[PDB]
Amino acid sequence: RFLKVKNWETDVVLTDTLHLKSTLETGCTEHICMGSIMLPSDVRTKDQLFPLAKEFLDQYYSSIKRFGSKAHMDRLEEVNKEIESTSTYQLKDTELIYGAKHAWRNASRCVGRIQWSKLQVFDARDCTTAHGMFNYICNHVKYATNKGNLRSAITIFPQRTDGKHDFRVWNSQLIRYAGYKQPDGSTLGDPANVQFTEICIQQGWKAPRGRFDVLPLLLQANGNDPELFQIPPELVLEVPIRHPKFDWFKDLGLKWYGLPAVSNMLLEIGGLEFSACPFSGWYMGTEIGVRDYCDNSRYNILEEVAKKMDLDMRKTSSLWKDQALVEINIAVLYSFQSDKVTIVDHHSATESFIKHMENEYRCRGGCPADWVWIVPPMSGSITPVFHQEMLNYRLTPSFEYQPDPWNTHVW
Amino acid sequence: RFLKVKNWETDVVLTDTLHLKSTLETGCTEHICMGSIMLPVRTKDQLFPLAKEFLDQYYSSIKRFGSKAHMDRLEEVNKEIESTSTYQLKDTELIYGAKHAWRNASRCVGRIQWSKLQVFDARDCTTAHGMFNYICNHVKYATNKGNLRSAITIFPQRTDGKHDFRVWNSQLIRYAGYKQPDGSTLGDPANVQFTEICIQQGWKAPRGRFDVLPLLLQANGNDPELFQIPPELVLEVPIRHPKFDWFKDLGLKWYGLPAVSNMLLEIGGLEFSACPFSGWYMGTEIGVRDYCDNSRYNILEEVAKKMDLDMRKTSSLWKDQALVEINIAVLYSFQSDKVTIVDHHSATESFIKHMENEYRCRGGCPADWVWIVPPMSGSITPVFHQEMLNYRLTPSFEYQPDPWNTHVWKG
Ligand code: HEM
Ligand code: HEM
Ligand SMILES: Nc1cccc(CNCc2cccc(OCc3ccc4ccc(N)nc4c3)c2)n1
Ligand SMILES: Nc1cccc(CNCc2cccc(OCc3ccc4ccc(N)nc4c3)c2)n1
Ligand SMILES: C[C@H](O)[C@H](O)[C@H]1CNc2nc(N)[nH]c(=O)c2N1
Ligand SMILES: C[C@H](O)[C@H](O)[C@H]1CNc2nc(N)[nH]c(=O)c2N1
Ligand SMILES: [Zn+2]
Questions:
Q1: Which helix (H) or strand (E) element contains residue A3?
Q2: Could you give the CA distance from residue B183 to residue A298 in angstroms, rounded to a whole number?
Q3: How far out from the chain centre does Cα B105 lie?
Q4: For residue A21, how many other CB atoms are within 10 A of its CB?
Q5: E strand spans, B94-188
Q6: Where do the annotations place (6R)-L-erythro-5,6,7,8-tetrahydrobiopterin binding (chain B)?
Q7: Which of B103, B106, B108 to mutate to test the pocket of ligand 4 (most atoms within 8 A of CB)?
Q8: In the Cβ-directed half-sphere of B360, how many Cα atoms lie within 13 Å?
Q9: Is A219 helix (H, G, I), strand (E, B) or coil?
Q10: Chain A positions in Cβ-Cβ contact with residue B323 (cut-off 8 Å)
């Protein structure tokens, strides 16, 4: 039970002991593996909270080489007393930064984790209003965008108290394109965002009804009704998509935004639940070119591109979809690189992740990793992660999924 | 207890109850997922329950459960076990078992075909020469002048583990590989170790780039013997590209018949250690893995050079572009020569239909996402978006150790 993972391309064997620190559950059993299920899975009682805090503070003081020290025991006692009285507790800034960086470090589905320690943490726990949230988010977007030299960042709004006063960003990402159902049956814009684009309109948002309309922010503070805000356009950096060989590619009229900023997850540190914690990095090209542009349930541009390439679209075995998919992804990378906007291709990112795995096994004893999500959605087996065995287990602090607010909110 | 899987592209939800019939273990636990691990002399004691379970399944399928034929057969097997320590399957039971081992193969995307398997009973075989004759007839039947037919040939079951029948080849038809003194490899790197054993056993190697390996066959626990498959039985396809006239000059060819020969077939507790089976290729097995794995023929560089791509930086996706062209050439060559092949779009679409049908008529379809998703263009195939449950059912195909590591040499 000191498990080993083999890379079948290189025969490198790593030994994993970190999984024995794991606490939460995978969803699998000895009789059935749920590793391809998208998502397995109210306030914390006074009891379950102190063990959670103790375990977190134990690993925090170990990381600063002060395990079993005066400061350690004192902080343990201090939090112990705060919980006994207040039925919760507040993190020190140092603890908050550590917790957020390690929630990313532990995100087994994230291929970009070699960067985990270079995370800018914005403490927004003093925020009280949607207008305040808007201000914090604009500052985040501007800092992270950095005129195309993207920088990772997270903004952490106040923690859940009793489930009635939740801070929530209702958008799934800070920047996403609208989607509208057409009278004929098709969809203009992003089909993934049709219900959200409806809620915004069904809320007051005057939609331009374009193909790439930046959605408004929909911000919930202290559990009140959410509020619409328009992100200043000069803060939304966008890349027009063109192809270094094909001039007609520009004519397609495609663009995408530079900042991937996920805003609907829940950050758990020491038992405390941060329901509003938008975070951002930079794109891997396939997220746009493969999934955003070519998923059948998204922009689904594959037919158009192949047609303009004059490919034989009559039989699947001509691999016209594969041919078009590559060209699309060459264009995305070329466009971002041309406009000096940070982006990583899937070969670079998976090579980086293999090196990160080696680092984590060496300096930490392991790295939880979800093969189903780490292997890119194109050209899987020519990237080094395809041939890498991975162990998936759930460490804390962590980012977790949470329900969509409009299914919960007492309106 | 019921379980649901969701297709996130179509929102189709399916309900699995078949996992309740699962006996064997997955390797996972509630605290770790081993879903990406490649690999996670039975006694009288444990054998009759395994037989009973199989015969219950068998007689259920023919709608004779609890019949006099069912009960008599159970008695007959029981007495045969207690008296002879093992038992013999009827021909009907063997055919059923072999088909269901394929039906239960959670890593196999081609299972829509499972009920159309030609089963060759080779349980009367006694020598390696007899094995050679049985395998030649299998290859001729399966090849069928390019109109491939699925087949399996089943040699005698294990007795005391000291008299195993084994096919030492990993596949019936495979190309030799030769490590050169300068560190380079001629032929197929995947087969260097086996090629060496063959050469040691007296095989005169042509030392070419595409040399069909000899069969190395072990009967009744004796030392294995070498045989050369008649070249007229080995159907091969020269690889050319439909637009690139220079592709032929790469000098590539591949064999037509994929015939895995190193797995163990388990039926009712009986172990068939030699059970070669064959179907037909999905194009990506050759074009992605065989040709473009860095640890295989690895022709990506040559193809990319002859296409004159930007090979300086990976973000030009020269590797991705060359991969698509190679896979176009594989499918084009096979189809032009009327040798059965299936592209990864057709094969995955069929699997989804198979899987839905299995959920309807059987209550489930165990499936290993990590293996079902093709090694290129993963997300533009429908299985990428399909949730799957993996669990172990019997009859089954299992891995077994390579014989050269366990064999006791006679001299
Ligand atoms: C800096 C560059 C980064 C890159 C290239 C990157 C890349 C990726 C990719 C490709 C995925 C798969 C998601 C999908 O395919 O839709 C992913 C997932 C994820 N990323 Fe990273 N990421 C980066 C930064 C970050 C940061 C800064 C955080 C948090 C602070 C983070 C947290 C996560 C999490 C939690 C997931 C998995 C979500 C889930 O469980 O479903 N990532 N990332
Ligand atoms: C009829 C056409 C067939 C096609 C197109 C097909 C396709 C495939 C593919 C692509 C794989 C993944 C293997 C890899 O990528 O290395 C696979 C796995 C497998 N196939 Fe099928 N197959 C076919 C027939 C069969 C037959 C006839 C059998 C047995 C009688 C079989 C049993 C298996 C098994 C047991 C595995 C899992 C191997 C493992 O766990 O390593 N297949 N198949
Ligand atoms: N309908 C629904 C509803 C719920 C869940 C899903 C699953 N749907 C996949 C998904 C959902 C949410 C986020 C996500 O992405 C994660 C992510 C996180 C950080 C990143 C940082 C940088 C970067 N470049 N990418 C990142 C991606 C995937 N679907
Ligand atoms: N280095 C190592 C060492 C140990 C184990 C492995 C696993 N190595 C993958 C593998 C091994 C053997 C066979 C195989 O293939 C399965 C298969 C079965 C039937 C097929 C029918 C048709 C078709 N087209 N393909 C089939 C593939 C995969 N690797
Ligand atoms: C590490 C991982 O288990 C291994 O590389 C697997 C991944 N998925 C695969 N899928 C298929 N079809 N064939 C393979 O050989 C593999 N290899
Ligand atoms: C069915 C499957 O769980 C689902 O489609 C997953 C598969 N792998 C993925 N991998 C990444 N990186 N992102 C995804 O959204 C998904 N989707
Ligand atoms: Zn699992």
A1: strand A3-6
A2: 48
A3: 9
A4: 14
A5: 118-121, 151-154, 166-167, 177-179, 185-187
A6: 36, 370-371, 384
A7: B108
A8: 7
A9: strand
A10: 379, 382
For residue A226, how many other CB atoms are within 10 A of its CB?
Answer: 24
Q: CA–CA separation, A189 vs A256, rounded Å?
A: 12
Q: A46-63 and A70-86 helices cross at what angle (nearest 10)?
A: 160
- Using CA atoms, how far apart are residues B230 and B214, in angstroms rounded to an integer? 10
Output the CA B388–ligand 3 centroid distance in Å.
Answer: 20
SS3 B154: strand
**Cited resolution, angstroms:** 1.8
User: H helices then E strands: how many in chain B?
Assistant: 12, 18
Contacts of B312 (CB under 8 A, 6+ apart): none
Residues in chain B: 411
Tokens, residue A299: 């922009």
SS (H, E, C) A299-323: CCCHHHHHHHCCCCCCCHHHCHHHH
Distance CA B279, CA B331 (A): 16
Distances (CA, A) of B265 to B161, B166, B221, B257: 15, 12, 17, 20
Assigned token pair, B136: 């030649």
At B324, is the secondary structure helix, strand, or coil? helix
Active-site choice (B80, B196, B236, B285):
B285
Round to whole Å and give the CA distance between B172 and B214. Answer: 9
The answer to whether residues B283 and B344 touch, using CB atoms and an 8 Å cutoff, is yes
DSSP-derived 3-state class of residue A173:
strand
Report the largest interatomic distance among the alpha carbons of chain B, rounded to a whole angstrom.
74
Q: For residue A195, give every residue at least 6 positions away whose Cβ sits within 8 Å of its Cβ, in sequence order, or none.
A: none
Residue at token pair 């962590």:
A398
Long-range CB pairs of A248-256 (<8 Å, 24+ gap) are: A248/A308, A249/A308, A249/A327, A249/A331, A252/A301, A252/A304, A252/A305, A252/A308, A253/A211, A254/A293, A254/A301, A255/A212, A256/A288, A256/A292, A256/A332
User: What 3-state class would DSSP assign to A153?
Assistant: strand
User: Percent helix, strand, coil in chain A (nearest 5)?
Assistant: 40, 15, 45
Rounded-to-integer distance, Cα B116 and Cα B150, Å: 7
Prior bond of B40 cis (ω within 30°): no
Query: What are the strands, taking DSSP E only, across B141-224?
Result: 151-154, 166-167, 177-179, 185-187, 215-218
Residue A11 CB partners (closer than 8 Å, separation 6+): none
For A382: left if phi > 0, alpha if psi spans -120 to 50, otherwise beta; the answer is alpha
Rounded CA separation A123/A119 (Å) = 13
**Candidate from B26, B27, B288 with C-beta closest to A381:** B288
- The β-bridge partners of A156 are A123
**Cβ density class B120-159: b for 16+ within 10 Å, e for less:** bbbeebeebebbbebbbebbeebbeebebbbbbbbbbbbe
Closest approach atom of ligand 5 to CA B36: 3
- In this complex, the residue of A19, A381, A393 whose CB is nearest that of residue B375 is A381
**Among the atoms of ligand 3, which is closest to the Cα of residue A172?**
12
CB-defined contacts A:B, below 8 A: 205
List helix spans (H) across A149-274. Answer: 194-201, 248-251
Query: What technique was this entry resolved by?
Result: X-ray
Tell me the backbone φ, ψ of residue B166, rounded to 5 degrees.
-140, 140
CA distance A255 to chain B (A): 19
